[PDB]
Design a protein around this ligand. Structure first.
Ligand SMILES: CCCCCCCC/C=C\CCCCCCCC(=O)OC[C@H](O)CO
Ligand SMILES: CCCCCCCC/C=C\CCCCCCCC(=O)OC[C@H](O)CO
Ligand SMILES: CCCCCCCC/C=C\CCCCCCCC(=O)OC[C@H](O)CO
Ligand SMILES: N[C@H]1CCC2(CC1)[C@H]1C[C@@H]3C[C@@H](C[C@H]2C3)C1
Ligand SMILES: [Cl-]
Lengths: 23, 23, 23, 23
């Protein structure tokens, strides 16, 4: 499922960027 | 699955909106 | 899949809670 | 799907970390 693939990549990137902004 | 579909859309929108708010 | 189900519910909830916190 | 599983775990962790940060 392409939608699931995109959402997974987006969530992983989202958590990383949020951690980097909090740091 | 409607729940997976809605959650994927919402995660994509959540990343978009969060980034725009941080900018 | 209970993990996917819980993650979908939780992602919806996370967007709700973040929008309300920023507002 | 390992990608979906990793992203689900990541989403649960993200809500946990974000809630702890807001509190
Ligand atoms: C093609 C995709 C390009 C993406 C758009 C690039 C534009 C960035 C503009 C100004 C940044 C200046 C602010 C310096 C960094 C602080 C904001 C921040 O930390 O955000 C990063 C994270 O993705 C969310 O917070
Ligand atoms: C599925 C279950 C969802 C349960 C949802 C829990 C609601 C939070 C409880 C009380 C808010 C306390 C009133 C103070 C208002 C600040 C908002 C707040 O602290 O909520 C936690 C989080 O930071 C986002 O708002
Ligand atoms: C899956 C494992 C995750 C491991 C958990 C690591 C927690 C380490 C926290 C601070 C050390 C670095 C200080 C960084 C300060 C940012 C604080 C932060 O991490 O935000 C979330 C936290 O629960 C509220 O702030
Ligand atoms: N925060 C979101 C919640 C929804 C999912 C992406 C991340 C998550 C992982 C996959 C399987 C379901 C639906 C999406 C794809 C649960
Ligand atoms: Cl935030």
């Amino acid at each position: 499922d392409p939608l699931a693939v995109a959402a997974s990549i987006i969530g992983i990137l989202h958590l990383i960027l949020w951690i980097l902004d909090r740091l």
